[PDB]
């Protein structure tokens, strides 16, 4: 978190940090139902928007 | 608004003339060794294709 | 009031006797079934709409079952337009109108009893690992629906423990020549080819493979759609099963439940088909495809989609026998993979060795 | 069905080889080309049309014989592709029913 404050202070932008729904890092979990499955966890939330 | 448009909307003068030439040109070279048989005559019932 | 219309003069003789036979087949409380056959002949929509309207206008029949003799699906679109015209439920059991037609017009009541390529494309992969046929190649011919066949191919191969390999070509031109066709036929990197061919070009493409020197049981092919080289697999979708009297009886069995599906909530018997063109209006219509989701009959689910095609079928796969005959080999009834011809003695039955030297025990 | 009674008794009674259709003056739900497409297409007779813009008559699976002179509504997307290029646009959001 401390590193984030350094970047923002020298880049002129703001933030509002929120945790992830489930504390699991992004993984594939290939189930093939939804066209070769889909992501989850933190890295699944990034691509959604 | 930057909508689109058709040049000849709801027009039939050119299309009617154009449709004649394509068929007429094709008929000119249609005379070949292959069958030039007309479609079946009569409207009671048929199976031939 | 039902319309059991058939196709072909040969079906007229059995149509008369099948009337009483299917009348007593299915009985439901507060329901009367009056089968009506027809002696009409001809594939053109000339007698297919004139006297058919007389059944609608005069007999006031609801629910039509169509049986066709020839394997030309040219008559399938004919009833599709008519189904959405008077908003009358139309179901075709089998015949020419067997292949699924998509997309269909809105508010279309046509029901098709056919299995699309999607369900067929599933059972083939199970028998591949059953007989250890992981290596395969899929090819196709110019068709309106070759995009779907190729699009799903990578979906199944994405998963599973064993590693799949895929290859193939894009199209083929029979008019180019046998040598030209065989020139591109040498790009072989597997033991089995999967081809998306049509009925009209099925015979020429089989003769095209003759020049490739692949006719014996040493090489096999699988047929997708509806001098024969050995080792051919086909699907019938109960085409050769359930006879015909049982098949035609089930056409009205679903309708009776569908009629009872709406009658329990409210009492209303539609009379939309009572007149063909006596009214210049077709606005009055509701629940056109609201029915036929959960239908149980003959201990088999009869679920249908919005397009109007069976989604829970009992498909049967048919192999090619050395006496130039086709017999069922695998049975697929409600996600069952029991099969027959047990997998033992690999590289033997259904595919003979090309060389009897590299295969050793 | 009113005009479907003359799909062959009148249209092909002259032993014609093609049928030309147009959008009806009444702006209804473009119902005029359905009978000719099924009937004349059943005989494998190609049909032509004018003032026709519907993407439903595109693939050969439902309509094997159909050659409309006027391209359908779906071609309006292609024009926008080059249009935004000279205005230096890279990211887009579409509103499509």
Curated annotation (Swiss-Prot), chain A:
Q: Which residues of the full protein are shown?
A: 460 to 508 of 938
What does the UniProt PTM comment say about this protein?
A: NMDA is probably regulated by C-terminal phosphorylation of an isoform of GRIN1 by PKC. Its phosphorylated state is influenced by the formation of the NMDAR-PPP2CB complex and the NMDAR channel activity.
Q: Related disease?
A: Neurodevelopmental disorder with or without hyperkinetic movements and seizures, autosomal dominant: An autosomal dominant neurodevelopmental disorder characterized by severe intellectual disability and developmental delay, absent speech, muscular hypotonia, dyskinesia, and hyperkinetic movements. Cortical blindness, cerebral atrophy, and seizures are present in some patients. Neurodevelopmental disorder with or without hyperkinetic movements and seizures, autosomal recessive: An autosomal recessive neurodevelopmental disorder characterized by severe intellectual disability and psychomotor developmental delay, involuntary and stereotypic movements, spasticity, and inability to walk without support. Intractable seizures manifest in some patients.
Q: Where in the cell is it found?
A: Cell membrane; Postsynaptic cell membrane; Postsynaptic density membrane; Synaptic cell membrane
Organism per entry: Homo sapiens (Human)
Q: Which gene encodes it?
A: GRIN1
Subunit annotation = Heterotetramer; the NMDAR subunits are modular and harbor tiered domains that function in concert to regulate opening and closing of the cation-selective ion channel pore. Forms heterotetrameric channels composed of two GluN1/zeta subunits (GRIN1), and two identical GluN2/epsilon subunits (GRIN2A, GRIN2B, GRIN2C or GRIN2D) or GluN3 subunits (GRIN3A or GRIN3B) (in vitro). Can also form heterotetrameric channels that contain at least two GluN1 subunits and at least two different GluN2 subunits (or a combination of one GluN2 and one GluN3 subunits) (in vitro).
Role played: Component of N-methyl-D-aspartate (NMDA) receptors (NMDARs) that function as heterotetrameric, ligand-gated cation channels with high calcium permeability and voltage-dependent block by Mg(2+). NMDARs participate in synaptic plasticity for learning and memory formation by contributing to the long-term potentiation (LTP). Channel activation requires binding of the neurotransmitter L-glutamate to the GluN2 subunit, glycine or D-serine binding to the GluN1 subunit, plus membrane depolarization to eliminate channel inhibition by Mg(2+).
| Superkingdom of the source species | Eukaryota
> Can you tell me which family this protein belongs to?
Belongs to the glutamate-gated ion channel (TC 1.A.10.1) family. NR1/GRIN1 subfamily.
Q: What is this protein called?
A: Glutamate receptor ionotropic, NMDA 1
Glycosylated residues are 12, 32
Swiss-Prot record, chain C:
The glycosylation sites are 41, 280, 294, 312
Q: List the disulfide bonds.
A: 53-276
Q: What is the effect of changing residue 89 to S?
A: In a breast cancer sample; somatic mutation
Description of its domains:
A hydrophobic region that gives rise to the prediction of a transmembrane span does not cross the membrane, but is part of a discontinuously helical region that dips into the membrane and is probably part of the pore and of the selectivity filter.
Please list the residue ranges that the record places on the Extracellular side of the membrane.
Answer: 1-361
Summary of the function given for this chain in its UniProt record: Component of N-methyl-D-aspartate (NMDA) receptors (NMDARs) that function as heterotetrameric, ligand-gated cation channels with high calcium permeability and voltage-dependent block by Mg(2+). Participates in synaptic plasticity for learning and memory formation. Channel activation requires binding of the neurotransmitter L-glutamate to the GluN2 subunit, glycine or D-serine binding to the GluN1 subunit, plus membrane depolarization to eliminate channel inhibition by Mg(2+). NMDARs mediate simultaneously the potasium efflux and the influx of calcium and sodium.
Location relative to the cell: Cell membrane; Postsynaptic cell membrane
* Similarity field: Belongs to the glutamate-gated ion channel (TC 1.A.10.1) family. NR2D/GRIN2D subfamily.
Record: disease: Developmental and epileptic encephalopathy 46: A form of epileptic encephalopathy, a heterogeneous group of severe early-onset epilepsies characterized by refractory seizures, neurodevelopmental impairment, and poor prognosis. Development is normal prior to seizure onset, after which cognitive and motor delays become apparent.
Subunit: Heterotetramer. Forms heterotetrameric channels composed of two GluN1/zeta subunits (GRIN1), and two identical GluN2/epsilon subunits (GRIN2A, GRIN2B, GRIN2C or GRIN2D) or GluN3 subunits (GRIN3A or GRIN3B) (in vitro). In vivo, the subunit composition may depend on the expression levels of the different subunits. Interacts with PDZ domains of PATJ and DLG4.
Q: What's the protein here called?
A: Glutamate receptor ionotropic, NMDA 2D
Q: Domain of life of the organism in this record?
A: Eukaryota
């Amino acid at each position: 978190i401390d590193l984030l404050i350094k970047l923002a202070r020298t880049m002129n932008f703001t933030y509002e940090v929120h945790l992830v729904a489930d504390g699991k890092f992004g993984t594939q979990e290939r189930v093939n139902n939804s066209n070769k499955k889909e992501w989850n966890g933190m890295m699944g939330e990034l691509l959604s928007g | 608004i930057l909508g689109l448009q058709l040049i000849n909307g709801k027009n039939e003068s050119a299309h009617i003339s154009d449709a004649v030439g394509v068929v007429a040109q094709a008929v000119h070279e249609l005379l070949e060794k292959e069958n030039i048989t007309d479609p079946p005559r009569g409207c009671v019932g048929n199976t031939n294709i | 009031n039902v319309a059991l219309v058939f196709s072909g003069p040969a079906y007229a003789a059995e149509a008369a006797r099948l009337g009483p036979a299917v009348a007593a087949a299915v009985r439901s409380p507060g329901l009367d079934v009056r089968p009506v056959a027809l002696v009409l002949n001809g594939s053109d929509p000339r007698s297919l709409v004139l006297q058919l309207c007389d059944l609608l206008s005069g007999l006031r029949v609801h629910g039509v079952v169509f049986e066709d003799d020839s394997r030309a699906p040219a008559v399938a679109p004919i009833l599709d337009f008519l189904s959405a015209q008077t908003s009358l439920p139309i179901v075709a059991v089998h015949g020419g109108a067997a292949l699924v037609l998509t997309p269909k017009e809105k508010g279309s009541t046509f029901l098709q009893l056919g299995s699309s390529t999607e369900q067929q494309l599933q059972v083939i992969f199970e028998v591949l690992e059953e007989y250890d046929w992981t290596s395969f190649v899929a090819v196709t011919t110019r068709a309106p629906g070759h995009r779907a066949f190729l699009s799903y191919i990578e979906v199944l191969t994405d998963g599973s423990l064993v590693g799949w390999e895929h290859r193939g070509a894009l199209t083929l031109d029979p008019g180019a020549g046998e040598a030209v066709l065989s020139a591109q036929l040498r790009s072989v990197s597997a033991q089995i080819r999967l081809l998306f061919c049509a009925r009209e070009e099925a015979e020429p493409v089989f003769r095209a493979a003759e020049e490739a020197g692949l006719t014996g049981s040493g090489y096999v092919w699988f047929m997708v759609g509806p001098p024969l080289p050995a080792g051919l697999f086909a699907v019938r979708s109960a085409g050769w099963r359930d006879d015909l009297a049982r098949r035609v009886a089930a056409g009205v069995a679903v309708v009776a439940r569908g009629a009872q599906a709406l009658l329990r909530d409210y009492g209303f018997l539609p009379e939309l088909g009572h007149d063909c063109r006596a009214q210049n209006r077709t606005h009055r219509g509701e629940s056109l495809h609201r029915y036929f989701m959960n239908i149980t009959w003959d201990n088999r689910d009869y679920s249908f989609n919005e397009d109007g095609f069976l989604v829970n079928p009992s498909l049967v796969v048919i192999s090619l026998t050395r006496d130039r005959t086709w017999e069922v080999v695998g049975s697929w009834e409600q996600q069952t993979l029991r099969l027959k011809y047990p997998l033992w003695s690999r590289y033997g039955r259904f595919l003979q060795p090309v060389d009897d030297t590299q295969h050793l025990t | 069905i009113q005009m479907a009674l003359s799909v062959c008794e009148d249209l092909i009674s002259s032993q014609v080889y093609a049928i030309l259709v147009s959008h009806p003056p009444t702006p209804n739900d473009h119902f005029t080309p359905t009978p000719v497409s099924y009937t004349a297409g059943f005989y494998r007779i190609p049909v032509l049309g004018l003032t026709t813009r519907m993407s439903i008559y595109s693939d050969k699976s439902i309509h094997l014989s159909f050659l409309r002179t006027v391209p359908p509504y779906s071609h309006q997307s292609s024009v926008w592709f080059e249009m935004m290029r000279v205005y230096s646009w890279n990211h887009i959001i579409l509103l499509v029913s």
